[PDB]
Design a protein. Structure first.
Lengths: 14, 133, 133, 14, 14, 133, 133, 14
């Protein structure tokens, strides 16, 4: 789709 | 012309620009998507008036640009963008302006346009495109 | 807690957050860089007060975060982020909070933090980091 | 430095 | 999926 | 130890490494995906033997790693990676080794591991991960 | 023609291709950089002979391509790439072939070409470029 | 330069 994607690391805290 | 650089965002929601069937492309103002929110960038105005405006409202995020093309030529001796065409996965907007001169095209097989930069004086002098996944 | 997602930007200029030496991390508000301009994101507030605030003003763009670390533990039965430490290429800010529980660390060899997302109730429940070149 | 970089193609119009 | 994605421009020649 | 850096590829197909329930992680050799083709990288050997090997064959591309975690501790005075766990979207491989010491975890919300680098002497001294969309 | 897709790598070291001053571009074989090592990709051959070859050996990594341009036109009724020019930060290689027809250009302000894909029959039918930081 | 860059996290084990 038209939404730019990002690298996301985590979550921390679970 | 006055240079501008909107920088990068996360997508495109709307593109408004001017054109003159006798000369070239004028000013332009892009409304980007910034993390799900519409973000209206700065209006990069032409030094003059007398243009016809076009407002391309994309059905974000299902609709996105897959190709930008147009023509480059001289107007009053200045090399400028005389015409523009924006093809999305849903339809084609344009051509707008004068389709004469040297053609250029940026088809995108994978990736997205996430920003624009360039220069505008009486007309759009030139422009560059930010690409990102 | 209430989930939040600031999304991605082009850098970090300032990070403000709360901490309680007896409990854990509270609310947080990040000021990102958005194509050269400071962009203050939404304030993700704690459901309560009684915290000590810390304001980390980074010397953008020469200074940037190279590691985020901290501790995860329970407070009133909830698993939350109890402590945080932000190391930049210039200095170290922290630890702030309670350095007890399970440690975590995200050292960055190459790349930049460009966004934060997570959840905050009485305390910071959890968080994720956006990375980009 | 701390400034995120982007792929930029162009310019067209020179 | 597990396949790394790339930005691809073109094709030219159609 | 001897440093290594496999660099970046387009995915992971198989990960083979050694471990000793009494000491730590030993050598490792990764088979990456390189544009649809399996690419067996260099074997980064331990300076010694006596390990138990594990071969993780991922169902590429439907299966991919979503988290790498483990423990860091001292063995004969050297700070090394004593245990490793690889969680994919399909299952969990591990823990392998000694789950004692300081824990670390790299959960991946979005993105892929596309390369490994580090150092191995008698044991895996340390390692870094390449991330990409 | 027979389609090909070299995929993505970490840079370009050498580009070898054929051209005929009377017709168009023929086959091509790219030597990429793969994490510091030269990686010779598959030879995408023309269905015929009679071409003049050109071998562009780039001074990797100090030298890199900043623009690819050329001409598209018909040869025996087939729309193909008739000419190519590769401009680097150090010099310009080309034009090679027939500079007649519709021009195209991909100037790169920031970023690198890291792969090629396309189709080759008697001549180079079309091609796409992989871009990455 | 002409070398493609990558996001690298770590090291863990120091
Ligand atoms: C002062 C100004 O902006 N003039 C505009 C033109 O810009 C001049 O163009 C020349 C080109 O040789 C050169 O790049 C110079 O730096 C520019 O100032 C140009 O933009 C023109 C057409 O749109 O409009 C003038 O107003
Ligand atoms: C209503 C609310 O947000 N309560 C906050 C807690 O959230 C609950 O936590 C449980 C965990 O088992 C579960 O995830 C649920 O969806 C949450 O509502 C939690 O954030 C807590 C500690 O910060 O504060 C409460 O206010
Ligand atoms: C010569 C060699 O590689 N020895 C290995 C150890 O490496 C030494 O470790 C120290 C740490 O203080 C220092 O980093 C030095 O540069 C290294 O040579 C180490 O890898 C050890 C445990 O795996 O094995 C030795 O063989
Ligand atoms: C069988 C074959 O590959 N023929 C080559 C041509 O390909 C045909 O081109 C048409 C175009 O209308 C169509 O795309 C078809 O799928 C192709 O097979 C073409 O590549 C030509 C010029 O290089 O050479 C033929 O050998």
């Amino acid at each position: 789709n038209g939404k730019s994607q990002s690298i996301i690391v985590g979550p921390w805290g679970d | 012309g006055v240079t501008f650089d909107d920088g990068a965002y996360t997508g495109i929601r709307e593109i408004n620009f001017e054109y003159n069937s006798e000369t070239a492309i004028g000013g332009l103002r892009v409304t980007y998507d910034l993390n799900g929110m519409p973000f209206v960038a700065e209006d990069h105005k032409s030094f003059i008036t007398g243009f016809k405006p076009v407002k391309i409202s994309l059905e974000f995020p299902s609709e996105y640009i897959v190709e930008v093309s147009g023509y480059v030529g001289k107007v009053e001796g200045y090399t400028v963008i005389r015409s523009l065409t924006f093809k999305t996965n849903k339809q084609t907007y344009g051509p707008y302006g004068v389709t004469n001169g040297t053609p250029f095209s940026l088809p995108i097989e994978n990736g997205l346009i996430v920003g624009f930069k360039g220069s505008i004086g009486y007309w759009l002098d030139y422009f560059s495109i930010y690409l990102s996944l």
